Structures are given as C-alpha cells and as structure tokens.
Design a protein around this ligand. Structure first.
Ligand SMILES: COc1cnc(C(F)F)cc1-c1cc(C#CC2(O)CCOCC2)ccc1C(=O)Nc1nnc(C#CC2CC2)s1
Ligand SMILES: COc1cnc(C(F)F)cc1-c1cc(C#CC2(O)CCOCC2)ccc1C(=O)Nc1nnc(C#CC2CC2)s1
Lengths: 674, 674
C-alpha cells in the first residue's frame, strides 16, 4: 500500500497490474477503488471489462462518467470507474462529507494527460488532494496507481506521489521501423493478401470519408459475408439510419470512423473491426486516444494534421496500435511523407514525448484554492501553503492573489481563517468552475424574476453549455428559424437577450469581431441557437431532421446532448446548494431528458439500461408506461413488439445478443430494478 | 492673412494684438471669427469684454460655451467666443453644412493646452481641420492666431500651422521670484500694511478654508467697511445662502476661493478682490488657470499638490498673477519651503515648462478619422494620409487600425470610398466621442422599448454624464434614499439596471473592486445616484437640501448641473440625427431645465438673460408667466417684487447694478426678446 507509478507501452497488458492491485486492495481492506479514465468511451469499456472480470467475486462495479451516474448509492459500490472531471467531483464530495476514509485506492490510467491539457489539471488537483489528506492523517491509507507511456520525468511524478517507479519498454509484438521511400494500392493489396486488417488515420473527417470511399472502389474493382451482412443490418436499425457512403463502403470490409458519426455507429464500426470483419478502417485523430483497437498495419496519411505537425504523443499512441498480442509476430506502422514533409517525418520518428507540465490568477489555481478552503482541509493560510507544496507544480506566490480573487467575488469569507459563504459551497458542490459561476449566478438569478413556463426553452437556455464551440452556427438558417419562431419562444428569446438586430447583422455581415470582453452578447445568440437545438432534441425529433433544420450533423448533436446533460446536472446541484428550490425542481427532470433526448413520459421507462430513446417509445406506445409494467410481461410479447437468432439490436457492452434474448434481458433487468 | 503664432507672458496686454486682428479681419472681410478659450469662466469673461469693446461698431459677439448657446443664428454672429469642445463642434457643423467659407479667422488663446490634456486633442483636431480645408481649397481664406506662455517648441507649432513666430519675455511689472526658508505674523502685518492684496495658493480645499480662517482670526485679534458690507449682502441673497466660515472671514478683508463654492460665490469673491475690497484671497489650483486676477504678492503653500510636486505649467501661471499693470511697480511670488521640500522648490524655481505632446487605437484618432470621413473631406485612404500629415503629430499607420474600428462598429461603410451610415452622421453631429456613442446607442435604444413617463427620472438617467467622478458617493445615504424611494422611481431604477444586492454590498462591504471590464454595473449605480441628484436639482430644491440629502457640496452640484446640461443637448442632437423623434421631443426640454435647474413653467421665463432660477420663481409666483408678460409691466412693479441704491443682486458680467435698474433691464431685455 505504498503507492505506485508505472509506465509501459500499451498492448503489453499494462492494466493487468492495476486490476490485480484493485483485487488485492478491495479484498483485503474492503475499501473503495476509483478507476479514473480520460474519456467516456474508454471509461465505459473499462467499466464493462471490470464488471465481466469481477462479477464472480460478488463485487459491484459502477462508474460516474459522461452524463450518467450509478443507480445505487456510492456506499454499495466497490469500484467506481469514473472520468477525470467526475472523479474530481467525487473527491470533492467525499471531502465535503468527511468520508475520505472510505476510499482505498485511486487507480489513474493515462497519467501523461496530467501535463498540458484542458483536463489534466483536474487530475493534478485530485491527486494533490489525495496526497494532502493522506499526509495530514495517517501505511495503508490510500494507494495511487498510475499508468502512461514512456515519460521523461516519470521518476519526478513518482517522487511527487511518494510512489515506487517501474518503466519498461516491452511489448509481445516488436515494432519495426526502417523508412523505405501516395503509392498505397500495392501496399494495401499485399497487406490484405496476408489476411490482415488495416487501420489508417486521416487529418480531416471529409478526407477520411473520401479515402474510405476510394479504397472501397479499389477493392470492388480490382478484387465473411454473413457477418458483414449482420453488421450492415445492425447499422440499418438505428435512429439516424445508415450513411450512404458507409452503405457503399461497408459490404467490402472497408469503412470510416469520425466524430461526425453517432456513438452507436462508431461502436458498431469498432466492434466490427475488433473481430477482423472490417479489413480497412479510415479513422481520425480522436480514435488514437480511444478504445483499445489493434491492427496489424497502421497507416498515417501525413505529419500535418489540422495545419500543424502531428503531435508526438498522438503519433506514439497511434503506432502503439500496430500489432496483436497472441496472433501476430510483428506489427507495422507506416507514415507516408513527402519532400517537404521528410524533415517533419524524421523529426517525429525520433524523440520521446515532451515533459509533463503542471498547468497551475489561473482558473486552475482559483479552483484548487476553492476546493481546499470549502473542503475544510486548508482554512488558515498557515497550512494552505503546505497544499501548494504538495502540488505537482511545487514538486517540479499565486495563492495570495487567488485567495483575494475569491474574497473580492464573495466566494469565501475571512475571520486568519477563511470560510465559504454560500457561493463557495454551491460552486464547489456543483463542480462548476469559479470563473463561470459568477455568470451562472447572474443568469439564474435574473431568470427567477421573469421565468417563462409556457415551454421548456427558458429552462433549456439556462442548462445550455457554451464552454466550447460544438458547431459553426449557420446564421441564415438561424434567421429563417427566428422568423418562423412562435411567440412563446420569442418571448424567452427577448428575455434572455437575443436581439433581432444582431441576427440581421450576422445573416449578411461577416461574423462580428468579438474583440471586447463586453461582447459576450455574441455568446447569447449562439446559446439561443443551441437551446433551440436542445429543445428539438428533447421534443424527440430525429437526428437527421435536426441536422437538416440547423446544419449540425448527428455527431455534434449527440456531443451537445451529452454536454447539456452534464451541465443541467451541475446547474441542478448548484441551485440545490444555493437554496433555489423552484429552480432545482424545474431543472431536476432535464438531466435525464437531455441524456436520452426523450419526453417527460419516457423518463421512467428509460431507467432500464436496455431501453434506448427509440425503444422506450415503441414499448411506451404498445402500452408499457413504467418499469414495473415492463417487469410483468412475457418474453415472447416484448420479442414480437421489438421485431415490429441473428443479432440486429445494438447495446453498449453487449455479447452474442439477438432479438430473442434481448427482450429476455429487458424484463430480467426490469425485475432487478424493482 | 498669413496666420500667426505668438507667445508672451500674461499680465502684459498680450491679447491686444489678437483683438486688433479680429477687429481688422471682421471689418474688412466681413467674415466670422472664432475665439477659442480653454475654460468656460475665462470664455464668458472674454465674451463680455469683446461685447463691451465692439458694441459701438455694430459687431455682434455671442459665444458657444458651457451649456449655453447664442439665442440668434450663427449667421447673424460676427465673433463667436467658444470653448475648445464647442469650437470643435462648430467647425464640424460648418464642414457638415458646407459653409466653412463663412469663417475668416480662428483665434486660439492658451495654445499650450495643445499638449498634455484631455481637451487639447480637440484643439489639435480643430486646427488640423482648418489647415486641411484651407490647403485643399485656397491667401486670405482663414487666419489662425495663437497665444501661450513660454513654449519650448513654439517654432514647431508655427511651422505646423505655417504661421509667423513672435516670442518675447516682457512684462510691465518685472516679476521677482524669491524662495525663502516665527516672523509669520510680522510678515503678514508688513505685507498688508503696504496697502496691497495677497493671493495664496493652497493644495487642499479644506486647508484653503482653514488657512483663510486663521488669517481672518489673526487680523481680528490684531485689530472700506461700506463696500465690504455691500459684498457681504451680495453674498447673503444667493440660492446657497452664505457660508459661515466665509461669513466670519469676509468682513476682515480675507476670503477663500475653491471649487467647493458656487459659480456666483466665486464670481463675487473674484470681483471683490479685483476692486481691492478683499485684501487676502486663499485660492486653489483651479484659479491659477482661471480669470485674470492680478495680485501684488502671490504665495504658494507647498509644491506638494495632491500628493505630488506642483506642475511646472501650473506654477508658471500662478506666478504670472504677481504684479498689477498700471498701479504696481514690482511683483513678488513667494514659495515657502521646508527641509525636505527645499529640493522640490528649487527644482520648480528653475526650468521652463515641458514640451507640448500631441496625445495622438487611441480614441482621439478614432474621433479625427470619423470627423474627416463623415464631414466628407477625406473619403479615400489616398487623401486621409494627407490629413495625417497635416496633424501636429506628423509635424512633430494607426489610421488603418482606426478605420477598421469604425467599420467594425458600423460607424462608416466601405465601397475604395468611405461613407457614414447613420451612427457616423449622428455621432459627429452630436459631438459625442465614438467610443461612448456605442453605449449611448445601446442605452437609448433599450429605453425606447420600455420608457417610464411617470416621472422625469428615466429621462434624467439617459442625460446623466458619467465621464468623470464629480463626487465620492456616500453609499449608506444612497441606500437609505433607495429604501425611501417611491415605487415610480424604483420602476425606472430596476429598468436601468440598479440592483438592491449591489447597493447592499456597497453599504457595508468596502467599495467593490472593479477589476473586470464587465463591471460597468458599478457605473450604473453611480449614474442612478447622479440622476437622483439631477432630479432634485430640476425639481428646484435648494442646493443646501441636496447637499444634506446626498452629501455633494454646492460646487459639485453646479458642476454636475453644467455637465448634465451639455450632455442633454448632445444626446438631443444625437437622437434628432438618428431619427428618434419621441426621444428627441422628451429630451429637448431638459437641456434648459438642467442649465438653470428650473421647472417646466419657468423655462420660457428664463429666456431673459437677467433672470436666475430664483428670480424667475419670484416673478413667476407673482404672475409674470411669460417673457411677453414681462415686456408689459412697469419698472416699479418689478422693483417692488424683487425687493420682497444698494447693489444687492449679482448677475454675470454685471455693472453698478442694484434692484432699482435691475428691474429696468429685465423689462428692457424682455422687450428686446420680443
Ligand atoms: C455536481 O456535479 C455533477 C452533477 N451531475 C452530473 C451528471 F448529471 F452529469 C455531473 C456532475 C459533474 C460534472 C463535471 C464536469 C464537466 C465538464 O468537463 C463538462 C460539462 O460542463 C462543464 C465541464 C465534473 C464533476 C461533476 C460531479 O460532481 N460528479 C459527481 N457526481 N456524484 C458525485 C458523488 C458523490 C458521493 C460519493 C461521495 S461526484
Ligand atoms: C451637439 O453638441 C452640443 C449640443 N448642445 C450643446 C449645449 F446645449 F450644451 C453642446 C454641444 C457640444 C458639446 C461638446 C462637449 C463636451 C464635453 O467636454 C462635456 C460634456 O460631455 C461630453 C464632453 C462639444 C461640442 C458641442 C457642440 O456641438 N456645440 C455646437 N453647438 N452649435 C454648433 C453649431 C453650428 C452652426 C454654425 C455652424 S456647434
């Protein structure tokens, strides 16, 4: 229980050590384990893997990722496979409730993210709080396990965490590198003739689509069918339908995988590839940091990705997916270069990843100071410097500046001793960034004076996140929709701040330059467009209909859905902690409605993990209006309802599931819910 | 008519050459002649002097200064004694109306203000426009005469204006500067016994008052009466009454003069000092650049003014007031010093004033570009660079940045010819700075959607200027007034943006730190406090009642009065040019009501220059409700009304006026108006 930080090339079973450590710790100390994964997809994959592995030892495994959360109290859980942001929230809530002693270990995967990143600082703060609380109260308190690629300063991280060090560059499939100067037809032909699949990464999404189409054309012209047809049918029965280009590419074992698709389509392509059924997949940069998806031959189209040299970490994690342990002898990754790109290619071939930074006036420091002060762990400035000493920045004078920033904005109160008033406690328990909480407070307080209850648009405007640019807003379409809007929605539009003059400016004049800080007025109209999209989402309209009506593809629609669900949950917690009972009551339902994009009727019927938003409606239309009603039904009835030995329906973390047994698991899990 | 730029010490008849030049030009060419003065008080004094000097030659003199404007069309005028800002506005209007050829000369006094100052850049833009128009369209077009103290780069100014150069250090009363460091009573006794006046310059208002108090006390302990009693009675019957400290200081030949007093009290004190009735006058830095008030001996309290060494220009214009031409032989300017202040004093005794800068992304450059483009004198970048060359900055590449700034904010439209749209023409005509015109547009547009006509407060909030901090707001009193406000005024308070939360924050907690640009919300509450003060002003409540109710002294109240009058006129012109007829109609009355602080009924009755706000009320309450009704009245009637050979009433630019002939002039001017 002396902590641990180790690194090893992926595909070497590096998570094996972590799984055994979780087993030993949870079985001996009977304490909790937090498994922190960087992204939601890998988080779900790991959650299902842990569930499958450990279901036989009477141990629960349920994770806090995305907009979801375990259906059971955290007390019953034994392993929590959460994400970085939600793991930080978990740590903050545990500190607030004075139950840190319940925690037995915090396993962290992909520790290299702790450096330069928009979410690495959350990991740094989480680990810093663990170290601080462990040092203040005492050698079996809380173990930390870390995983990553070859880190130049891995020993520095181990010293920071007071953990052992273990780094070995061993992989069952050695990776060979000998540059030999598109000329891809013969290469792909000789790769396929060897009975091997191909994974090729492209810089753009349209470029990936086009390359998949071209490769399908090559294979169709020049040169199992049952499983391919099964995958085709699986793709067909989806809310968003089947892509035309995907339609003409899939039958030839060639397809594409980009952020434009929906999560279900991406899952279908990934699962098809893992079986070898897809012989060519044109992916993008996102898949590099996605689920474990090995391929004998990996292809990288160009060192230039998005108008800049491809990152060394991205290249390393792309090449790490070259070779299969147990069936391959040697994998291969090829980076096609050019005369001008030869220098970039040779530069990327050599050199390890850059050193890990700290990313700590800065919003991260204000966040950390708030966390410690309102967590009741660093109240007096005497001990608050020990926390700064515990940070990775120290291990590798802004505290006074940030502390003042919190008192100026009434986040904390001074008495020598600092305390939170109500926005410090509402900000920390809400897991909202203190910088944006001022705007959130101002907007919510304004809404409660003049709220519009005719429709859900005013509630949607308050749970609409604009922390990132999900899509390039089309302003002519937006103006047309504004013209077509009813009066009920226009009332809320005027209330929030949307002006017809600004839309008139944008429809014809170029995007107004937001040079001045006071031009958050641009963010208001983007937020209103997003809120209209969200209203269409929760009105249960098809993804394609929204895509044509607003210009946002289905992938961006789903990403906005997840962001709005998480933001609605966060705002609900904020309002609950601020004592805004009517606001909390209005916002409580919306988290699930955004999560699933369903109407108020289906909220109870989506508590079954096996019931989608489309499957909730067909079961709801048939006459099942509640989980209890589902619990009382024959398998054959739901089977025929769904139909109106070969696998068609798709669900996350699935198995050899067919329509026959799919209905059986709906009632079985419905019974368990009761 | 070859322009001219000359410098000479004040108190040497340095304006005689200028008066001669205006006389000759106006009589020969029969063309107008502006006379730009820096401040409103000196502008009024010069206007009255020119009126007296040229009334016998059929030359009409009436200036555009402060919140006032001539009652007759500019066409009838022969000399316009305007201020820097209003002279710039006059030239802009002349350019807009394509009647620039009416101008025969532009005499500029105190040209040293061209350098470091918040109003010098207006002078630079004015002179640059004169030069550009003269050169683009030609020997005797528009003469420019200049004046200043000893200027290190006077020849540079002459070269910029392409004018002559004359610099002379000659004064009839050669000044004898002498710094020296018990005997104070003896020095005061020997100075006063010489039958000469003394002018002290103290840094603080309170210290000036207290020093005058101690000097009066010492004169009393060590101890014409009729004329001093006349001055005392003149001070007595003023709207602000008589100051107790001034009451006990005046009758000993001692008095004080600061911005705290009212314009009428300052005028009375200055007149009494000029006649010799006041022997000792403790003034402040403001009087240094004010009216021509010579003194035999000037004394400077300490070079430390406002926590910093006294300015060199300020010190020079202080010593310039030492010596009377015609009755005195020599002048003395003593600067008492201490051990620590000896170095600063010695530094101030030696050395001339610093060179004149230009003060030209900068708002001044945006203003200049807007003026030229909207005026139709530089529509293409080819010639606009010529205007840049004409500037004093050139004579001693930001245009592209400024032109984009105007296109970004829709001040001008590109076609490559440039034009104004509506806000470019409305911004130039109103003489509003383009930086603040965006906020003004946003606020006025928002008001027209939800205007409150119950009271005059919502109109006042839109004509309240917050370009400077006229007073330090006492937030406890403001909160008390807030909780005591009616509902009609609270409606407008909530409409504009005033929140009880911010007022509560300020009432107990320290003044909130406005570290962020989004915190113009502090300016809203200061503006509302100022608008309440203005509402009490135009409601015709006494100055003392406002001072007790709000904490702002009478001098600050009058300064805010003038600022609000000018801003109301500017906003009225802005609304007129933008085509806002109802807003212009509502704002049209308020300029005069704010100029005089009267009610709607007295607005017509104050058209007589010889009628204060108090003199309009006593005549109105009697039954004279119109200027025409005044024209039909006997002198004895108005005299008895005023009562209910002694010069007891004060009026600007007065003469041996008592209540007997004061009534006579009221009816005489009433007839002239008709
Ligand atoms: C109150 O906070 C949430 C509420 N609800 C949801 C859910 F509904 F989605 C998610 C959150 C959340 C969102 C982000 C985030 C984020 C972004 O990256 C993306 C969205 O926009 C802002 C930035 C980070 C942390 C949290 C969070 O606190 N998680 C937890 N939940 N239970 C917990 C417990 C417990 C007791 C056992 C001890 S800890
Ligand atoms: C439209 O502008 C005004 C309207 N009305 C008043 C009056 F009612 F007060 C004053 C102004 C004004 C204010 C400032 C100013 C200023 C500050 O320093 C102080 C206040 O806040 C902003 C900064 C500067 C210029 C002007 C102005 O244009 N003057 C003129 N009037 N007729 C003119 C003519 C003509 C035809 C013969 C050719 S030119």
């Amino acid at each position: 229980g002396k902590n641990l930080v180790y690194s090893a090339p992926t595909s070497a079973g590096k998570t094996l050590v972590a799984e055994l450590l979780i087993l030993k710790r949870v079985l001996e100390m009977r304490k909790k384990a937090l498994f922190i994964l960087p992204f939601v997809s890998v988080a779900k994959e790991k959650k299902y893997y842990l569930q499958s592995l450990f279901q036989e030892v009477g141990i629960k495994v349920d994770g806090y990722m995305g907009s979801t959360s375990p259906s059971r109290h955290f007390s019953s859980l034994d392993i929590a496979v959460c994400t970085i942001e939600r793991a930080n929230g978990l740590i903050n809530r545990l500190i607030e409730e004075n139950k840190m002693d319940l925690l037995g270990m915090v396993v962290v995967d992909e520790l290299h993210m702790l450096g330069d990143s928009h979410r690495g600082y959350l990991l740094e703060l989480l680990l810093t709080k663990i170290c601080y609380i462990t040092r203040k109260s005492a050698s079996n308190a809380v173990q930390i396990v870390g995983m990553s690629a070859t880190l130049p300063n891995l020993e520095l991280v181990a010293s920071w965490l007071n953990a052992e060090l273990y780094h070995t560059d061993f992989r069952p499939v050695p990776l060979l590198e000998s540059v030999k100067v598109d000329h891809v037809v013969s290469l792909c032909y000789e790769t396929i003739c060897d009975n091997h699949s191909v994974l090729l990464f492209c810089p753009s999404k349209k470029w990936c689509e086009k390359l998949a189409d071209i490769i399908a054309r090559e294979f169709y012209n020049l040169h199992e069918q049952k499983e391919l047809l099964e995958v085709m049918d699986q793709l067909r029965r989806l809310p968003s339908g089947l892509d035309s280009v995907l339609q003409k590419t899939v039958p030839w074992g060639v397809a594409f995988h980009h952020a434009g698709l929906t999560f279900e389509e991406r899952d279908i392509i990934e699962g098809a590839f893992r079986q070898g059924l897809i012989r060519v997949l044109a992916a993008t940069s996102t898949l590099s940091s996605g689920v474990n998806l090995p391929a004998r031959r990996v292809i990288i189209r160009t060192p230039i990705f998005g108008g800049r040299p491809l990152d060394i970490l991205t290249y390393k994690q792309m090449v790490g997916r070259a070779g299969r342990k147990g069936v391959d002898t040697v994998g291969e990754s090829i980076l096609i270069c050019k005369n001008s790109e030869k220098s970039k290619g040779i530069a990327l071939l050599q050199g390890s990843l850059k050193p890990v930074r700290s990313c700590l006036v800065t919003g991260s420091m204000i966040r950390a100071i708030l966390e410690i002060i309102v967590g009741g762990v660093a109240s007096t400035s005497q001990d608050m410097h020990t926390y700064a000493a515990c940070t990775f920045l120290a291990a590798s004078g802004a505290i006074e500046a940030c502390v003042m920033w919190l008192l100026e904005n009434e986040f904390i109160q001074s008495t020598k001793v600092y305390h939170p008033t109500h926005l410090g406690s509402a900000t920390l328990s809400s897991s909202l960034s203190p910088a944006d909480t001022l705007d959130i407070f101002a907007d919510l307080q304004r809404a409660m004076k003049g709220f519009v209850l005719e429709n859900d648009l005013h509630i949607l405007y308050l749970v609409t996140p604009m922390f990132e640019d999900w899509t390039t807003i089309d302003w002519y379409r937006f103006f047309c929709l504004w013209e077509k809007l009813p009066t009920s929605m226009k009332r809320v539009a005027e209330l929030v701040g949307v002006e017809e003059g600004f839309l008139a400016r944008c429809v014809k004049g170029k995007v107004v330059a937001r040079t001045e800080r006071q031009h958050r007025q641009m963010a208001i109209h983007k937020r209103f467009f997003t809120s209209l999209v969200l209203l269409d989402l929760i009105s249960e309209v098809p993804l394609r209909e929204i895509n044509q009506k607003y210009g946002c593809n289905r992938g961006q629609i789903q990403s906005l859905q997840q962001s709005a669900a998480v933001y609605a949950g966060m705002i609900t917690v904020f309002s609950n902690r601020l004592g805004w009972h009517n606001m909390e009551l209005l916002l409580s339902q919306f988290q699930k409605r955004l999560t699933f994009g369903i109407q108020r009727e289906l909220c109870d019927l989506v508590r079954v993990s096996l019931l989608n938003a489309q499957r909730a409606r067909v079961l709801y239309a048939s006459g099942f209006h509640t989980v209890a009603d589902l619990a009382r039904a024959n398998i054959v009835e739901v089977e025929v309802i769904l139909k109106n030995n070969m696998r068609t329906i798709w669900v996350t973390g699935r198995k050899g599931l067919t329509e026959r047994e799919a209905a059986a698991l709906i009632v079985e899990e419905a019974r368990m819910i009761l």
